[PDB]
Subunit: 234 residues, 2 copies
């Protein structure tokens, strides 16, 4: 089971509590975070609004449910989740250390006709980050949704960005646990940007991963980053 | 980056089969340049019940081929090969790399032809996409199973992408994009993957594999780029 990270938000109208969910596992099926994984999510998910980044409270039936501190107004906001860095041993004969980090970012439009770009287009500081350059509410089927990929604050050229949606691939309860089939794939340009072309309406997840050398070679050797951006089309 | 694919005209029973060798950027057919003629030193092959036969290079442009004889209703293969070429590569050192490319097109002659006897048998391409079903039976959103073979054996964990003519067209030029894919997934332990087409049209599936060259005394690395073209819908 690969175990990737993404973020989901329920339909929220202005003035009520924004409920969100931390998906850790196989998209799009949410699952409770296991006992041996809790230390990985030591820091709660964050809500990004005009006042900035604020912590969310882990309230709900399951341990992956979060609720906003105060009610939220209409606008376009971000919900971010982080898999805190973990170290593990790998090989291939001269085993080595790898640091895994994962990030999830969800675009949430609180209120109909809300398609702001001021907040959602600003980088939030994730090691590997997908910054939307437009609001998904304006993107119809067949239109292009430009995003930028940033690694360590700089644009990432030639990075493979894939994208899928809930209901595209429907199989493999647990028999393979393989990564889901993608409905889109393309590489970023020199400015780190790529146009996602959605062919279906629904809840979409875009994904990018980068593997590189760890900065401090005297502590660890490799670093792997998996990042997703979740949004709505239509 | 030039790649190999095959296109076939709409063909009925009793007429010659016209096919085109695409060497370049899909789906723009281009004449094979003077300095590239030696690479395509063997003609495109037509695979039928009687096996593999050479096609005849007839037409205004040098990428155009016809079958030797009029073809009957059925399901046939048209294959093209970019013959192995060696080039030097630097990292710092210098090593030999052999490049080979393959293309295969499933062509149904007759409006009701959905045979599988010919198109599902491997042809012997070093890197090959073997269809396990006829695409004429595949409607939009259904699964089209293929297997990937490398040196005759199934190739697991290989990335297969797919796109169609007309998917990415914006601002295409001699120095631009339109490599965007409408599908991407990895093969399983049996080398099989289900392409899920979301639109009708002229589709191309692609896979590549970089490995060590067999005879390390002569060359070091090998790179294979392989295509499968087909029609979805009518
Ligand atoms: Cu509503
Ligand atoms: Cu016809």
């Amino acid at each position: 089971m690969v175990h990737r990270v993404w973020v989901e938000t329920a339909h929220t109208h202005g003035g009520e509590y924004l409920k969100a969910d931390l998906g850790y596992g196989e998209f799009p099926e949410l699952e409770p975070i296991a006992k041996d994984r809790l230390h990985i999510f030591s820091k709660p998910m964050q809500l990004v609004t005009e006042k900035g980044k604020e912590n969310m409270i882990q309230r709900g039936t399951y341990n992956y449910q979060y609720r906003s501190n105060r009610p939220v107004k209409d606008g376009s906001y971000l919900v971010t989740a982080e898999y805190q860095p973990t170290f593990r041993s790998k090989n291939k004969d001269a085993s080595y250390c790898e640091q895994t980090r994962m990030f999830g970012k969800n675009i949430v439009n609180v209120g109909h006709e809300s398609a702001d770009t001021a907040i959602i287009t600003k980088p939030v500081g994730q090691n590997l980050e997908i910054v939307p350059l437009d609001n998904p509410a304006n993107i119809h089927v067949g239109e292009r949704f430009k995003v930028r990929v940033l690694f360590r604050g700089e644009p990432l050229p030639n990075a493979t960005v894939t994208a899928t949606f809930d209901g595209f691939d429907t199989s493999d309860r647990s028999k393979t646990h393989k990564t889901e089939a993608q409905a889109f794939s393309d590489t970023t340009d020199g400015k780190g940007e790529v146009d996602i072309i959605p062919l279906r309406q629904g809840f979409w997840k875009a994904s990018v991963e980068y593997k590189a050398d760890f900065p401090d070679q005297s502590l660890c050797q490799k670093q792997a980053n998996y990042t997703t951006l979740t949004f709505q089309i239509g």
